[PDB]
Structure 1
Amino acid sequence: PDIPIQYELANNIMENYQKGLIPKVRKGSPINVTLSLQLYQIIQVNEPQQYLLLNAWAVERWVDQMLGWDPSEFDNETEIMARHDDIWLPDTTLYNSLEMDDSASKKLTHVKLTTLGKNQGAMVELLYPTIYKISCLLNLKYFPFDTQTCRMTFGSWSFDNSLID
């Protein structure tokens, strides 16, 4: 009738879904997460406090083995946009971050769900802008002709290699 097909799609795929648990139907394999980074700006290289302020564009892709639907049933449709609140998100952490509030370093709004099949899951694309307060060591021996290398360690804080890769 007047109800959109995406309403039925989201009601169907997010029916028995539990966002508080890792969507790993298969037992013997971790969830592969593909993190991609773009540098947009270097806001501040703060020598006195060993912190660098970066403005990055982070893209995060994995496969959610529970949010899979058949495109033929739901009117040919192969994509749907949901909210980051409604699905399980990997806890990608910047290990050397100097900011503990994730509302000042991340702008998670929406996720994109592309189906691979009913029982095969769906690709989840997570695009969000970040502001990283990075703890980097400065070797100011050749100041002001110095070059500095800044490391960004990314990983899951609570999930090990057997759960999230």
Structure 2
Amino acid sequence: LNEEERLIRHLFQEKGYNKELRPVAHKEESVDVALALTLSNLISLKEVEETLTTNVWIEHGWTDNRLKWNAEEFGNISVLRLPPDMVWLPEIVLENNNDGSFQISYSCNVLVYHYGFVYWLPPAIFRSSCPISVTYFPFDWQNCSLKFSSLKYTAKEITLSLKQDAKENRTYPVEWIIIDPEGFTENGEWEIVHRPARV
């Protein structure tokens, strides 16, 4: 019998996993959700419609202790791939969207690691509201933004934070938009000067 089948029966049916309930020991705890954003392409900026269209990959990470297992008890399965409809999600949305598309476009699998970390990298096409400043046009620069928050959970139930990377065993927060230094095709009309992130 496939060890994945046994492990999934264990996690979801045997332990009775409820995706409706937050992964907390006590209701007063908030789940830390870490976000990073990878900009795949800057599709367009339309000044007449004041709309920024971007292709992005939103790297979610959080801990769900209900999804822990010992790999040696399940044939050294260290990572598991699940439909996002099965697990509890923090339900993050693009707040400043321009067209009513609040949620992510493609519901890809979540990766659940044996130590309980849930990693998700949904790709999405977003059309955000970017108010244009026309003063110096054409030599203008625009300060667009993407604002992510949860409407289903408040700041008491889940905590937003930036992803931390590490070098020389010293951690630091990733305070900027991730861009591929070689695969990123630049937009035909716009150059990215700065790309900070703030909580």
What TM-score do the two structures reach when normalised by structure 2? Answer: 0.74
Equivalent position amino acid for 1:140 in 2 = V
Q: What is the CA distance between 1:69 and its match in structure 2?
A: 1.6
Q: 2:26 and 2:54 mapped to 1: Cα distance?
A: 37
Alignment of 1:37-76 (within 5 A): 37-76=37-76
Question: 2:81–2:109: 8 Å Cα contact kept in structure 1?
Answer: yes
Q: What is the CA distance between 1:21 and its match in structure 2?
A: 2.0
Question: 2:41–2:54: 8 Å Cα contact kept in structure 1?
Answer: yes
Q: 1:53 and 1:62 mapped to 2: Cα distance?
A: 27
Alignment gaps of 5+ in structure 1: 117-121
- Residues 104-138 of structure 1, C-alpha deviation per residue, up to 9 Å, x if partnerless? x511120100022xxxxx10111121111010111
Report the counterpart of residue 98 of structure 1 in structure 2: 98
Equivalent position amino acid for 2:111 in 1 = K
Q: Aligned pair in 2 of structure 1 residues 28, 115: CA closer, same or farther (>3 Å)?
A: farther
- Residues 16-41 of structure 1, C-alpha deviation per residue, up to 9 Å, x if partnerless? 00112222234443111111111111
Question: 2:50–2:129: 8 Å Cα contact kept in structure 1?
Answer: yes
Question: 1:25–1:65: 8 Å Cα contact kept in structure 2?
Answer: no
Report the counterpart of residue 124 of structure 2 in structure 1: 130
Q: 1:131 and 1:41 mapped to 2: Cα distance?
A: 10
Report the counterpart of residue 190 of structure 2 in structure 1: none
SS of aligned partner of 1:11: helix
Q: 1:58 and 1:86 mapped to 2: Cα distance?
A: 19
Q: 1:100 and 1:83 mapped to 2: Cα distance?
A: 24
**CA RMSD, 1 decimal:** 1.6
Question: 1:23–1:65: 8 Å Cα contact kept in structure 2?
Answer: yes
Matched, 1:109 2:108: yes
Alignment gaps of 5+ in structure 2: 160-199
Equivalent position amino acid for 1:64 in 2 = D
Report the counterpart of residue 164 of structure 1 in structure 2: 158
Q: What is the CA distance between 1:100 and its match in structure 2?
A: 2.4
Report the counterpart of residue 8 of structure 1 in structure 2: 6
- Residues 59-68 or 139-148, more deviating: 59-68
Question: 2:94–2:102: 8 Å Cα contact kept in structure 1?
Answer: no
Q: 2:52 and 2:132 mapped to 1: Cα distance?
A: 10
What TM-score do the two structures reach when normalised by structure 1? Answer: 0.88
Q: Aligned pair in 2 of structure 1 residues 152, 93: CA closer, same or farther (>3 Å)?
A: same
